[PDB]
């Protein structure tokens, strides 16, 4: 499901650099948005620490986004890890947009559902589906 | 997971 991975990232994306003032999935991207607006607002100290982790410069490559995800992801996936990697996609867009680097922003997205289409759809698949977010989340 | 973030314990 790469294509709706990849509007599922867009529609957040879009939905987030809005918020900073910068019937199929419909589901998913409302509770989507919901869970990430939570978790900014519970986890601000712990995401600051998350966020410091990584600045996306015009030289920087998806391995470095990798590498900072991977700890995220280091000893398995639930779905506050999941909330976690899209509000740090949002931070990083954010961040891009702020500091003038606004063509960041699809460099950005693309990262995140390679990312999501590799290493996370596989948990997602075993672990109840979007569904399953959906009914804890939305 | 073990719980390394704050979020992990809601899971």
């Not at chain 1, 790469?2 to 918020?19: A, F, P, T």
């Not at chain 1, 986890?43 to 410069?57: K, N």
Request: hydrophobic share 35%; proline share 2%; net charge negative.
């Amino acid at each position: 499901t790469g294509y709706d991975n990849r509007e599922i990232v867009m529609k957040y994306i879009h939905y987030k650099l809005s918020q900073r003032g910068y019937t199929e999935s419909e589901v998913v991207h409302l509770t989507l948005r919901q869970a990430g607006d939570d978790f900014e607002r519970r986890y601000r100290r712990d995401f600051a620490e998350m966020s410091s982790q990584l600045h996306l410069t015009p030289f920087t490559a998806r391995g470095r986004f990798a590498t900072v995800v991977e700890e995220l992801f280091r000893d398995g996936v639930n779905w506050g890890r999941i909330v976690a990697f899209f509000e740090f996609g949002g931070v990083m867009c954010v961040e891009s947009v702020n500091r003038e680097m606004s063509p960041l922003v699809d460099n950005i997205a693309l990262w995140m559902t390679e990312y999501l289409n590799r290493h996370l759809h596989t948990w997602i698949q075993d672990n109840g589906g979007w569904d399953v977010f959906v009914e804890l989340y939305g | 997971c073990p719980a390394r973030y704050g979020w992990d314990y809601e899971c």
